[PDB]
Design an enzyme around this catalytic site. Structure first.
Site, PDB file in Angstrom:
ATOM      1  N   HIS B  43     -15.011  15.602 -34.589  1.00  0.00           N
ATOM      2  CA  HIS B  43     -15.572  14.855 -35.713  1.00  0.00           C
ATOM      3  C   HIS B  43     -15.929  15.682 -36.964  1.00  0.00           C
ATOM      4  O   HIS B  43     -16.190  15.062 -38.022  1.00  0.00           O
ATOM      5  CB  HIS B  43     -16.689  13.893 -35.337  1.00  0.00           C
ATOM      6  CG  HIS B  43     -18.022  14.570 -35.275  1.00  0.00           C
ATOM      7  ND1 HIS B  43     -18.623  14.875 -34.060  1.00  0.00           N
ATOM      8  CD2 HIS B  43     -18.782  15.063 -36.265  1.00  0.00           C
ATOM      9  CE1 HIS B  43     -19.821  15.422 -34.376  1.00  0.00           C
ATOM     10  NE2 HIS B  43     -19.958  15.531 -35.701  1.00  0.00           N
ATOM     11  N   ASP B  99     -14.717  14.428 -27.915  1.00  0.00           N
ATOM     12  CA  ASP B  99     -14.959  14.992 -29.297  1.00  0.00           C
ATOM     13  C   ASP B  99     -14.803  16.531 -29.284  1.00  0.00           C
ATOM     14  O   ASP B  99     -15.727  17.325 -28.951  1.00  0.00           O
ATOM     15  CB  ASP B  99     -16.287  14.398 -29.679  1.00  0.00           C
ATOM     16  CG  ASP B  99     -16.724  14.794 -31.099  1.00  0.00           C
ATOM     17  OD1 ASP B  99     -15.955  15.243 -31.947  1.00  0.00           O
ATOM     18  OD2 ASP B  99     -17.950  14.718 -31.201  1.00  0.00           O
ATOM     19  N   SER B 197     -23.957  19.176 -35.803  1.00  0.00           N
ATOM     20  CA  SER B 197     -22.654  18.844 -35.240  1.00  0.00           C
ATOM     21  C   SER B 197     -21.722  20.033 -35.059  1.00  0.00           C
ATOM     22  O   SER B 197     -21.348  20.791 -35.951  1.00  0.00           O
ATOM     23  CB  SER B 197     -21.849  17.855 -36.160  1.00  0.00           C
ATOM     24  OG  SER B 197     -22.455  16.542 -35.933  1.00  0.00           O
TER      25      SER B 197
HETATM   26  C1  LIG Z   1     -18.417  12.436 -39.372  1.00  0.00           C
HETATM   27  C2  LIG Z   1     -18.935  11.679 -38.114  1.00  0.00           C
HETATM   28  C3  LIG Z   1     -20.177  12.153 -37.574  1.00  0.00           C
HETATM   29  C4  LIG Z   1     -20.222  11.356 -36.176  1.00  0.00           C
HETATM   30  C5  LIG Z   1     -21.576  11.557 -35.513  1.00  0.00           C
HETATM   31  N1  LIG Z   1     -22.708  11.345 -36.562  1.00  0.00           N
HETATM   32  C6  LIG Z   1     -23.955  11.053 -35.899  1.00  0.00           C
HETATM   33  O1  LIG Z   1     -23.913  10.617 -34.734  1.00  0.00           O
HETATM   34  C7  LIG Z   1     -25.175  10.905 -36.812  1.00  0.00           C
HETATM   35  C8  LIG Z   1     -26.151  12.030 -36.552  1.00  0.00           C
HETATM   36  C9  LIG Z   1     -27.589  12.570 -36.602  1.00  0.00           C
HETATM   37  C10 LIG Z   1     -27.570  13.867 -36.027  1.00  0.00           C
HETATM   38  N2  LIG Z   1     -28.160  13.759 -34.660  1.00  0.00           N
HETATM   39  C11 LIG Z   1     -27.809  14.170 -33.474  1.00  0.00           C
HETATM   40  N3  LIG Z   1     -26.689  14.943 -33.382  1.00  0.00           N
HETATM   41  N4  LIG Z   1     -28.513  13.847 -32.459  1.00  0.00           N
HETATM   42  N5  LIG Z   1     -25.826   9.635 -36.526  1.00  0.00           N
HETATM   43  S1  LIG Z   1     -25.261   8.154 -37.308  1.00  0.00           S
HETATM   44  O2  LIG Z   1     -25.205   8.498 -38.752  1.00  0.00           O
HETATM   45  O3  LIG Z   1     -26.439   7.255 -37.012  1.00  0.00           O
HETATM   46  C12 LIG Z   1     -23.478   7.812 -36.846  1.00  0.00           C
HETATM   47  C13 LIG Z   1     -22.478   8.046 -37.828  1.00  0.00           C
HETATM   48  C14 LIG Z   1     -21.158   7.840 -37.527  1.00  0.00           C
HETATM   49  C15 LIG Z   1     -20.786   7.415 -36.241  1.00  0.00           C
HETATM   50  C16 LIG Z   1     -21.747   7.176 -35.263  1.00  0.00           C
HETATM   51  C17 LIG Z   1     -21.398   6.748 -34.014  1.00  0.00           C
HETATM   52  N6  LIG Z   1     -20.045   6.584 -33.693  1.00  0.00           N
HETATM   53  C18 LIG Z   1     -19.248   7.532 -32.889  1.00  0.00           C
HETATM   54  C19 LIG Z   1     -19.638   5.069 -33.297  1.00  0.00           C
HETATM   55  C20 LIG Z   1     -22.355   6.552 -33.032  1.00  0.00           C
HETATM   56  C21 LIG Z   1     -23.713   6.728 -33.376  1.00  0.00           C
HETATM   57  C22 LIG Z   1     -24.095   7.169 -34.626  1.00  0.00           C
HETATM   58  C23 LIG Z   1     -23.136   7.383 -35.582  1.00  0.00           C
HETATM   59  C24 LIG Z   1     -22.787  12.148 -37.903  1.00  0.00           C
HETATM   60  C25 LIG Z   1     -21.425  11.880 -38.586  1.00  0.00           C
END
Ligand SMILES: CCC1CCN(C(=O)[C@H](CCCNC(N)=[NH2+])NS(=O)(=O)c2cccc3c(N(C)C)cccc23)CC1
Lengths: 10, 248, 26
Positions: B43, B99, B197
């Site tokens: 990602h 991922d 990430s």
């Molecule tokens: C470029 C795509 C990335 C995918 C994952 N993303 C994240 O999951 C961010 C992160 C906060 C950081 N926290 C943590 N790591 N615990 N959360 S989100 O903006 O609410 C979010 C953004 C994009 C996809 C998400 C997803 N899909 C795979 C369906 C599941 C849950 C949250 C998503 C950040 C963007």
């Protein structure tokens, strides 16, 4: 924010 | 990282920073696994829904850093990428299954006090360490709250049982994933956050005193939300694809 | 050589929180 990196790199 | 602390120097020598050349900007975390290979989340490169699709020239690899923002004058090494490899079945359409991605460096990097690879788990290390309650460690330069640190941060979290993992969200959870974080009860906290990430979730084996990369920081619903958990790529499970591409 | 840090494992020094990981493995 970020400080400059040597163009050697870029 | 949320609820973490500053890392000591050389605490996490495999830690890599994915850096954008223009705009120059922190992209993701990543990990050094050999002198020419970097491991990160797919990602970090490709996410079509948000129009993301970085190629090799869009990027730089910064190894040996401690500061987020400064050019660590004779400490870090910047590297160019030779090629990028994405899992052929990573699922960006629904849940970020598989991922993962590998990055091959233009030239081998030199080890040092601030730069050293982490090991990849074997079936048996996976077997005995991936267990509810054990703690792993996550590190990264991401946001300090759901904001920007001066130095690499570190937190230690317990792995969570599948059922809870599952019962916490509406996303379909696969065998290629695991979750970690304390529970609302536990009265202890922290998580990965934006910018974290692609970094490593690591464990230290008690049998050989070696560090192992169990996960890659995948996805999560917010940063440190009660009854939510960070999700990570099951490195052991995708071992065969890793071997395959380095062999190949 | 993987997994042994020059500034900790190599010199036999422990980092400030690795004890928490180890205390959790059982
Ligand atoms: C470029 C795509 C990335 C995918 C994952 N993303 C994240 O999951 C961010 C992160 C906060 C950081 N926290 C943590 N790591 N615990 N959360 S989100 O903006 O609410 C979010 C953004 C994009 C996809 C998400 C997803 N899909 C795979 C369906 C599941 C849950 C949250 C998503 C950040 C963007």
């Amino acid at each position: 924010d970020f400080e400059e990196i040597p163009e050697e790199y870029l | 990282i949320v609820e973490g602390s500053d890392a000591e120097i050389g605490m996490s020598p495999w830690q890599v920073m994915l850096f954008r050349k223009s705009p120059q900007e922190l992209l993701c975390g990543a990990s050094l696994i050999s002198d020419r290979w970097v491991l990160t989340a797919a990602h970090c490169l490709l996410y079509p829904p948000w129009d993301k699709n970085f190629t090799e020239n869009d990027l730089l690899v910064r190894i040996g850093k401690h500061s987020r923002t400064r050019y660590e004058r004779n400490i870090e090494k910047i590297s160019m990428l030779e090629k990028i490899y994405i899992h052929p079945r990573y699922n960006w359409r629904e849940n970020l299954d598989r991922d993962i991605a590998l990055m091959k460096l233009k030239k081998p990097v030199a080890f040092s006090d601030y730069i050293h690879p982490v090991c990849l788990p074997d079936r048996e290390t996976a077997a005995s360490l991936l267990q509810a309650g054990y703690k792993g460690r996550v590190t990264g330069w991401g946001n300090l709250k759901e904001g920007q640190p001066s130095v690499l941060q570190v937190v230690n979290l317990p792995i969570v049982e599948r059922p809870v993992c599952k019962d916490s969200t509406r996303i379909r959870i696969t065998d290629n994933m695991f979750c970690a974080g304390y529970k609302p009860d536990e009265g202890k906290r922290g998580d990965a956050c934006e910018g974290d990430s692609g970094g490593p979730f690591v464990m230290k084996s008690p049998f050989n005193n070696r560090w192992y990369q169990m996960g890659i920081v995948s996805w999560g619903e917010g940063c440190d939300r009660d009854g939510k958990y960070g999700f990570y790529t099951h490195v052991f499970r995708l071992k065969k694809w890793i071997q395959k591409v380095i062999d190949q | 050589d993987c997994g042994l840090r020059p500034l900790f494992e190599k010199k036999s020094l422990e980092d400030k929180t690795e004890r928490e990981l180890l205390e959790s493995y059982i």
